[PDB]
Amino acid sequence: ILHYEKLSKIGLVKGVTRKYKIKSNPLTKDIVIKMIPNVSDMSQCTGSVMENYKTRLNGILTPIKGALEIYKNNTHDLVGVIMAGVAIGIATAAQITAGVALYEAMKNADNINKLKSSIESTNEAVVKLQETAEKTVYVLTALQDYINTNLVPTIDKISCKQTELSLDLALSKYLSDLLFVFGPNLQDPVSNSMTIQAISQAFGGNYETLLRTLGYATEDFDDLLESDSITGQIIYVDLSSYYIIVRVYFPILTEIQQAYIQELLPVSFNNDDSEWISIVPNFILVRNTLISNIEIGFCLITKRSVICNQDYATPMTNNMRECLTGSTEKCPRELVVSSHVPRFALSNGVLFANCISVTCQCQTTGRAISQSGEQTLLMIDNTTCPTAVLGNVIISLGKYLGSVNYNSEGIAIGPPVFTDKVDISSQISSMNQSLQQSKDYIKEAQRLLD
Amino acid sequence: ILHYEKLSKIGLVKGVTRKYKIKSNPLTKDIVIKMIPNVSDMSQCTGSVMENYKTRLNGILTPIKGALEIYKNNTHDLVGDVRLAGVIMAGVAIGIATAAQITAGVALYEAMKNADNINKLKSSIESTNEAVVKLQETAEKTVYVLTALQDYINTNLVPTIDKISCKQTELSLDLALSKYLSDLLFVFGPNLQDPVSNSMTIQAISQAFGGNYETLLRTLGYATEDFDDLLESDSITGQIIYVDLSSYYIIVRVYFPILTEIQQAYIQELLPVSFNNDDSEWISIVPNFILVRNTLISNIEIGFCLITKRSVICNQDYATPMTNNMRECLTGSTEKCPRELVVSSHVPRFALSNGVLFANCISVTCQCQTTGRAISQSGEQTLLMIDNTTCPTAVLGNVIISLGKYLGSVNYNSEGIAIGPPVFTDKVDISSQISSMNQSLQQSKDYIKEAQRLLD
Amino acid sequence: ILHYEKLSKIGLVKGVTRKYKIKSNPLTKDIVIKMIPNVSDMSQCTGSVMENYKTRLNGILTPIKGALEIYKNNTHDLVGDVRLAGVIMAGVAIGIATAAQITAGVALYEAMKNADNINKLKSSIESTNEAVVKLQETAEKTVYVLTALQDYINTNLVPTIDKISCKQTELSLDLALSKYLSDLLFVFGPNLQDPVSNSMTIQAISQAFGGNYETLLRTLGYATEDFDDLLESDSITGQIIYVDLSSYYIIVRVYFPILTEIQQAYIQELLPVSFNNDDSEWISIVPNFILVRNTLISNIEIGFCLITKRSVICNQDYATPMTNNMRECLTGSTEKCPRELVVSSHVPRFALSNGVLFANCISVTCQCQTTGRAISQSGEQTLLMIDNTTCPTAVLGNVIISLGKYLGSVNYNSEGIAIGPPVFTDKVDISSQISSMNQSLQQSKDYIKEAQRLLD
Ligand SMILES: *[C@@H]1O[C@H](CO)[C@@H](O[C@@H]2O[C@H](CO)[C@@H](O[C@@H]3O[C@H](CO[C@H]4O[C@H](CO)[C@@H](O)[C@H](O)[C@@H]4O)[C@@H](O)[C@H](O)[C@@H]3O[C@H]3O[C@H](CO)[C@@H](O)[C@H](O)[C@@H]3O)[C@H](O)[C@H]2NC(C)=O)[C@H](O)[C@H]1NC(C)=O
Ligand SMILES: *[C@@H]1O[C@H](CO)[C@@H](O[C@@H]2O[C@H](CO)[C@@H](O[C@H]3O[C@H](CO[C@H]4O[C@H](CO)[C@@H](O)[C@H](O)[C@@H]4O)[C@@H](O)[C@H](O)[C@@H]3O[C@H]3O[C@H](CO)[C@@H](O)[C@H](O)[C@@H]3O)[C@H](O)[C@H]2NC(C)=O)[C@H](O)[C@H]1NC(C)=O
Ligand SMILES: *[C@@H]1O[C@H](CO)[C@@H](O[C@@H]2O[C@H](CO)[C@@H](O[C@H]3O[C@H](CO[C@H]4O[C@H](CO)[C@@H](O)[C@H](O)[C@@H]4O)[C@@H](O)[C@H](O[C@H]4O[C@H](CO)[C@@H](O)[C@H](O)[C@@H]4O)[C@@H]3O)[C@H](O)[C@H]2NC(C)=O)[C@H](O)[C@H]1NC(C)=O
Ligand SMILES: *[C@@H]1O[C@H](CO)[C@@H](O[C@@H]2O[C@H](CO)[C@@H](O[C@H]3O[C@H](CO)[C@@H](O)[C@H](O)[C@@H]3O)[C@H](O)[C@H]2NC(C)=O)[C@H](O)[C@H]1NC(C)=O
Ligand SMILES: *[C@@H]1O[C@H](CO)[C@@H](O[C@@H]2O[C@H](CO)[C@@H](O[C@H]3O[C@H](CO)[C@@H](O)[C@H](O)[C@@H]3O)[C@H](O)[C@H]2NC(C)=O)[C@H](O)[C@H]1NC(C)=O
Ligand SMILES: *[C@@H]1O[C@H](CO)[C@@H](O[C@@H]2O[C@H](CO)[C@@H](O[C@H]3O[C@H](CO)[C@@H](O)[C@H](O)[C@@H]3O)[C@H](O)[C@H]2NC(C)=O)[C@H](O)[C@H]1NC(C)=O
Ligand SMILES: *[C@@H]1O[C@H](CO)[C@@H](O[C@@H]2O[C@H](CO)[C@@H](O)[C@H](O)[C@H]2NC(C)=O)[C@H](O)[C@H]1NC(C)=O
Ligand SMILES: *[C@@H]1O[C@H](CO)[C@@H](O[C@@H]2O[C@H](CO)[C@@H](O)[C@H](O)[C@H]2NC(C)=O)[C@H](O)[C@H]1NC(C)=O
Ligand SMILES: *[C@@H]1O[C@H](CO)[C@@H](O[C@@H]2O[C@H](CO)[C@@H](O)[C@H](O)[C@H]2NC(C)=O)[C@H](O)[C@H]1NC(C)=O
C-alpha cells in the first residue's frame, strides 16, 4: 500500500516481496551429552589427566546444576504446576515460563537417569540406549571419536607418556571451546532460548549429528537452523558421571496471514548537483494496512520469505509512514560522497537509473540516453529504449506499467540530513542551541510586548 | 536511590542488584610459544614444505618484531638520577604515541630483562619435540615452551610414517601447517597493527597454540577462584615481549589480574514490562542497568562486561554520563521517561519482583486460580500489582504462581501515574525526527523573526 | 587543513596521517572445490553414510545451482553489432535485480566460457583422491582441485582400516562428514541467498575446504604485493561459477584486486585526551578519523577498513558526508565542537604528538625532572603543552619521556580557547534528548502561536 512510483523517483526502486514466517508450536525430544570420553580401553596410559579434567569440568558444570535446582526446589505438582512466588523472589516473565517447562521435562529426566550406569558404559560416539521397553534415549559422547579412531589405534605405535599427553590436549582444547558457551557466560540456564548450535558445542559443534540422531527432517530443516529457531534447554546435570540432558525444541515455520515484507532497492538519485540517497527503511513490514518497521537484522532472509525466530516488528514515525505512501517531501536524503553507491536498479523488467552519474546509452538506437538536470532518475523501458546499456551491462527492457510520463512528471524532494553517529550528537546539540536562542527572543519579545 | 514504585508503574520492575567488580594489580608470568613444529622425527618426508612455511611465517612475524624494536631502541635506563628510578622513553624519537601505547612500552622494557634470560636457552627451545615442555631455566625459576602442531606431528604423522607413504606424510603436513596459518592470521596478521599495547585477550594470543588457551593457563598455574570469571570478562591479557625470526618462537607475558569490588557501588537491573496506556502497549525507554556509586547515578556500558548472578565483572571502569532528565525520571519524574509504542507479538507482559506480580492484564489474561475470578485491568491503569491481598495464587496464561505481600503503597492499583512523552528509536527514524524537528524549528524562528520585525 | 592547535586544546591531539588505498582491477583465476571425499580406498567400510551425505549435500547445493541458472538462462551473446561486443541480459526475464547483482551475472557469463572448459575433466575431478590435486585444463593452462575431508580419509581412516573395525571406520566417517556440514552451513546454508554477486570473502568460501584458505590461495598463486593487507581488508573475493549436483564439486572464480591509493587524499587520525574545563574532565566528541581529499573534509566509516601503520586499506570507498558545523569545528570553530562529561576511571589523560606532550596535568601528576620543578596546570587551563621550551625531559606519573620542541604558538599554554556545548551520547539519552527537545519546541510554538494571535 506504498506509493512505489513516487518512491522510485527518489531512489527507492521496488524490490522483491517476501512472506513473513515465524517459529511456533515446538515439539520436544530429549538427548544426553556425556562430556567425558570413555577411556577404559586405555586405562593404563591415563595418569592424573582424567582426574584433573573431572575437577575442571565439575567446576564449570556446578553453577549450571545449581541454577537449575533454584527452580526444581520451588515447583510442586497438585491438581498443572505451581511456582513458589515468594521463594523465587525476582524472576522475569520468560524465566518462569522456562521453569514451568523444566518441571515437565523433569518427569522424563529421572526416567532417563535410571540408565545412569548404562550411560557411563557408552564407549562410542553416538549410542542408543534401548535396554528398556520403548525408552530408547540417545547418548552423544564428547571426544569419543578421538579416543577410538586415534588414541587407541596408536596405543603402542607411540608410547604411554605420549598417549597420555595427547589425551590431555584434546580434553583441554575441548574445554577451551566448551567454555565459550558454558562458561560464566551461561548465567541463566533456566531459560530455553539457547540456540541448538550453541548447545552442540558440548558435542564439538556437530549439531548436524545431534539433530539427525534425534531423527528430525523437514523441508525447512535448514531454514529453521539458520533462523535460530531450533533451541535447546539444559534439563539435568550429573556431577558424578559428567553428562547433561538437553531437551531440543524443534518448531514449525508458519506464515503470518495478511502480511508481507516489501524490500526497497536503493539507487543514488541526482537533485541539486550532487548525488543523493533517500534515508528510508529498506525493508517494510505490512500487516493488513499497518506499515511498521522490522528489525530484519535478526532474521533469515531467503528469496521467497523472511524467517524470524520471533516477531521483530517495531513502530515507525508518522512522517516516515506518510513519506512511504506519497508525501515524498517528508523523505530525508543524505549527500553521497563515495565512488561506490547503487546507480540503478531493475524493477519488473524496467530500469531506474541516475544517468547524470552513469553511462546510459541505447544500444538499439545506437544513440545515448540523456538526463535533464531537473530529473532525479530516469525510467528506461521498452518504449524509450528497447535494449539499454547502463554502464558496462547491456540489458533488454520491458514495458513500464505506470504513468507514461514518469520522466516528465517530477517530484517534491525531502529535507537533507546526516546520519553519522558523531554528527547526530552535533546536530542535536546544534539544534538545541538555536532552540534556546529562539525561546529567548520569544521570551524577551513576549515580555516587552504584553 | 531510585523510586522503584513509580518506576514499576511504567513497566520498569525492580530486578536483581549486583556488585561492580573491575580487574587490577596484575601479576605477570612468561611463556614461550614456538610456532614451528619439530619434524626431526620425519626429516625424510619433509620436502620444501618446512622451507616455504618458514618464509610464510617470517612474513607475518616480521612486522611484529619490527613494531617492538621501535620501542626497544628508545628506552634506556634512567641511570644517574638519585631521586627517580626507572626507564626513560625517547619522546622525539617515538614521535606520535598514545597514552596507553607508551605505558605498554615501559612495560615491555621491564620484560626485556627476563626476556634475554629466557633467550639464553634458544637452542634448548628449538630442541623441544613435545606439545608442552618445561625448560628448566635457573635455580627454581623455569620457563615453559608450547609448540604448535606438535601434538599432530607426534600422534598422527609419525605413527603412520610408513602406514601411508612419504609423499603423503608430506602432503598432510603441508595442510596442517597451512590450516594453522589460516587461523593464526586472524590474530597476528596485518590486523595486529600495534603489538606494543598489552590489551590483547589471552584467548586471542593462544591462537598461536591452536586456541588451547586452557592448556596455556593450567601449564602456568591459575591459583585463583575468579579464574573463569576473569577469563570471560576478558581480563587475562597477554603481551608480545620478543620475536625470534630464526627459530620462530615468541615470548608472551601473561597478565593474571584480580577482581576488586568498588566500594559503595552497585548495578541495579530493571526488568522491562509492556504497560498499557492509551489503547496501545508501551515500553519505557530507560536504562536497563544502572550504576550507582554513593549517590551518583550513571549509565554503564555493561555490554563489555560479564554479568553473573551476583555481580558485574568488567575489565575496566565502563561508567558513562547520563542526561539530567533521565536521572530525574529514574527518581520520580516519570513524565520525563520516554516510552515507545509496542507493535510486536513478543515483548514481556509481566515480571515477578519480590514475590509480587506486575502485569499488563490488558494484553495478557490474568485470573485468580483460588477464587476463579478474572483479575481484570482498568483502562486508566498501566499495570497491575497482583499480591496476597488480591490473589493468593494467580494464573498468567500457562503459569500459576503463588504470590507474596507487596511492601509499598497499599493502593498501588488505584494510585495512578503521570506518563511520559512517546518516542521512536529506530535508527532511520532518529534521522527523520531530527530533520522533522529542525523543519518546525526553522519555521518558528521565522514567525518569531517576522513578528519581531513587524512588532518592534 | 585542520586547525590542529585549537583542536589539541580540546583533547584532540594530532596523530598519525595515513594514505587511503582501495581495491581495484581484479585478476581472476579459477579453481574447483570437491565437497565429497574420495572413499574408493575403503569402499567396504562405507555403509549408507556416503549415500545420505550425498542427499544432504544435494540439498544445500541445489538452491545455489538454481539461483545461478536464473541468470544463465537470460544471457545470450550480442550477435549483430559492429561497434559494441559483449553480453546482453534479459531484463524482462530477470525481472527484479539490483545494480550489482546484474554486473555479477555479466561477470558469471564470461566465466562460464572457461567453466565448461574445466567441466570437460569431470571424470578426472571425481578421480581425485588427494587433498590438493593438479589437473590439465588445456595443456599450458591448468586448473586445481581441492577435496574436502580428504586429508582425513587418507591420513586417519585408511591407516586404521583394520586397527579398529568396519563399523567404526564407518561411524567415524559419518561424524567427520556431519561436522563438515555443520561448519559448511554457516556460509552455504540458506544464508547464501544471492550467489550471483561476487562480494563474498575468499575466507568465507574456503569453508567448503575446511577454512584452509591459506592452501587455497598458496595453491592458486598470489602476487607478492599488498597480499596480507588485501586479505584482511576483505578484498580477495570469490564467486560461485558452477555447481555439479552429480559429482558434488563447485567452480569458484577468485578475484585478486590491486590496491590503488587514491591521490590528493589522506586520513588524519586524532588521539583523544581527557581535558579539564569546569571542574570535571571532558572529551571532545569529534571524529577520530578524518578523510581529506584535496580540500574536502568528510567522515569515513573506517570501521569496515583495515588500518595499518602506513595507510587505510578499504575494499571500496567508504566516505560519508559530514555536518557543516562539524567541519567548521575541525578547522577553528572550537565552540562548535561538542564535549561529553567523563565519569570513568580509565580515559586517556595525555598523548605524544611529534615529540611534544599534551596532558591534563590537573588529574595526572606532572613534573619536570630536568629541573625538579613540578609542572603545574591552572584551573582556567584545558590541557598543557609540555615541550623543550619549558621542560626538556618531563615525568607524568611514573612514566618518563624526553620531549622535543613544539612548532606552534609559543604561548599555547597562555592562549586559551572557546569551549563547545556539552552533550550526551548514550543511545538511551539520545531518545530522551530528542523527546525533551520536541517538548520545549511544541511549547515555544504555542507561545509564538498564542502571542501571534493575540498581537496581530
Ligand atoms: C628540542 O627538540 C628539538 C627537536 O625536536 C632539538 O633539536 C634537535 O636535536 C637533535 C638531537 O639533540 C639534533 O640532532 C640532529 O639531527 C640532524 C638531522 O636533521 C636534519 O634536518 C635539519 C633541519 O633543520 C638539518 O639542519 C640537518 O642538516 C639534517 O638534515 C643532524 O643533521 C644534526 O647534525 C643533529 O645531530 C646528528 O648528527 C651528528 C653528526 O655528528 C650525529 O652524531 C648524530 O647522527 C646526531 O643525531 C637535531 O639536529 C636538532 N634539530 C633541530 C635543533 O632543529 C632540541 O635540541 C631540543 N631542545 C633541547 C636543547 O633539548
Ligand atoms: C514492449 O515490451 C513488452 C514487455 O517487455 C513486450 O510485450 C509484452 O510481452 C509479451 C510480448 O511478446 C506479451 O505476451 C504475450 O505473448 C506471450 C507469448 O506467446 C508465445 O509463447 C511462446 C513463446 O516462447 C509460444 O508458445 C508462442 O510463440 C506464443 O505466441 C503469450 O503469453 C500471450 O500471447 C501474451 O499476450 C497476452 O497476455 C497479456 C498479459 O497478460 C495480456 O495483455 C493479453 O491477454 C495478451 O493477449 C505481453 O502481453 C506484452 N505486453 C503488452 C500488453 O504489450 C513487447 O515485446 C515490447 N514491444 C516491442 C514490439 O518492442
Ligand atoms: C536545519 O535547518 C537549517 C536551515 O534550513 C540548516 O542550516 C542551513 O544549511 C544550509 C546548507 O544546506 C546553509 O545554506 C548555505 O549557507 C552558505 C551561505 O549562503 C547563505 O547565506 C545566507 C544565510 O544567512 C542566505 O542568503 C542564504 O541562506 C544563503 O544560502 C552557502 O555556502 C551554501 O550555499 C551555497 O552552496 C550551495 C552548494 O552546496 C549552492 O547550491 C548554493 O547556491 C550556494 O552557492 C549553503 O547551502 C544555511 O546557511 C543554513 N542556515 C540557514 C541560514 O538557512 C541546518 O543544516 C538544518 N539541520 C539539519 C541538517 O537537519
Ligand atoms: C633498532 O636499533 C638497531 C641497532 O642495533 C637497528 O639495526 C640496524 O639497522 C640498520 C638500518 O639502518 C642496519 O644497517 C644496514 O644498512 C647499513 C648501511 O649503512 C649496512 O652497513 C648494514 O650492513 C645493514 O645492511 C643494520 O643491519 C641493523 N643492525 C642490527 C642491530 O640488526 C634497527 O634498525 C633499529 N630499528 C629501528 C626501526 O630503528
Ligand atoms: C501473604 O503471604 C506472606 C508470605 O509472603 C505472609 O507473611 C509471611 O508469612 C511467613 C510464613 O508463611 C512468615 O515467615 C516466618 O516468620 C514469621 C516471623 O517470625 C513467623 O511468625 C511465621 O510463623 C514464619 O515462621 C513471614 O515472616 C511473613 N511475613 C510477615 C513479616 O508478615 C502473609 O501472612 C500472607 N498474607 C495473608 C495474611 O494472607
Ligand atoms: C513533537 O510533539 C508533537 C505533539 O506534542 C508531535 O505531533 C503530534 O504527534 C501526535 C502523536 O504523537 C499526533 O496525534 C496522533 O495521536 C494518535 C497516534 O497514535 C492518533 O489518535 C492520531 O493519529 C493523532 O493524529 C499529532 O497529529 C501530531 N501533531 C501534529 C499535527 O504535529 C510531534 O510529532 C513530535 N515530534 C517529535 C520530535 O517527537
Ligand atoms: C533445594 O531445596 C532443599 C530443600 O529440601 C534444600 O535443602 C538442602 O538439601 C540438600 C539435600 O542433598 C542438602 O545437601 C543441603 O545441605 C540442604 N540445604 C540446606 C540449607 O539445608 C537446598 O538448599 C536446595 N538445594 C539447592 C538449590 O542448593
Ligand atoms: C539545551 O540547552 C539547555 C541550556 O539552555 C540545557 O540545559 C542545561 O543543562 C545543563 C547540564 O545538563 C544544566 O546544568 C543546566 O542547568 C540546564 N539549564 C536549564 C535548566 O535549562 C539542555 O540540557 C540542552 N539540551 C540538549 C538538547 O542538549
Ligand atoms: C533454465 O533453462 C532450461 C532450458 O529450458 C530450463 O529447463 C529445465 O532444465 C533442466 C536442467 O537444468 C532439465 O533437467 C529440465 O528437464 C528442464 N525443464 C524445463 C524445460 O522446465 C530450466 O528449468 C531453467 N532454469 C530455471 C528454472 O531458471
Residue numbers in the entry:
A (entry chain C): 27 to 105, 112 to 482
B (entry chain B): 27 to 482
C (entry chain A): 27 to 477, 513, 522 to 525
What did the study's authors say about this model?
Henipaviruses have two surface spike glycoproteins. The G glycoprotein attaches to cell surface receptors, and upon receptor binding triggers the F glycoprotein to execute virus-host cell membrane fusion, facilitating viral entry. The henipavirus F glycoprotein is a trimeric class I transmembrane glycoprotein synthesized as a precursor F0 that undergoes post-translational cleavage by host cell cathepsin-L within the endosomal compartment, yielding the fusogenic F1 and F2 subunits held together by a disulfide bond. Crystal structures of other paramyxovirus F glycoproteins in both pre-fusion and post-fusion forms have been reported, supporting a model of the F glycoprotein undergoing a transition from a metastable pre-fusion state to a more thermodynamically stable post-fusion state upon activation.
Here we report a 3.4 Å crystal structure of the NiV-F glycoprotein in its pre-fusion form. A GCNt helical bundle motif was fused to the C-terminus of the F glycoprotein to stabilize it in the pre-fusion conformation. The fusion peptide (FP), residing in the N-terminal segment (residues 110–122) of the F1 subunit, is docked into a groove formed by the F1 subunit of a neighboring F molecule within the trimer. Furthermore, the C-terminus of F2 and N-terminus of the FP fold into a β-hairpin (S1-S2), that forms a continuous β-sheet with β-strands S3-S6 in the F1 subunit, thus securing the position of the FP and stabilizing the pre-fusion state (inset). The cathepsin-L cleavage site (R109-L110), located on the tip of the β-hairpin S1-S2, is easily accessible for cleavage in the F trimer due to its surface exposure and structural flexibility. The structure of the NiV-F glycoprotein most closely resembles the pre-fusion structure of the PIV5 F glycoprotein and the two can be superimposed with Rmsd of 2.5 Å between 1160 Cα atoms. NiV-F crystallized in the H3 space group, with two F trimers in each crystallographic asymmetric unit (AU), which, together with the other four counterparts in the two neighboring AUs, form a hexagonal arrangement of six F trimers surrounding a central axis. The two interfaces in the hexameric assembly would stabilize the pre-fusion F conformation by burying β-sheet S1-S6, and preventing separation of the F1 and F2 subunits.
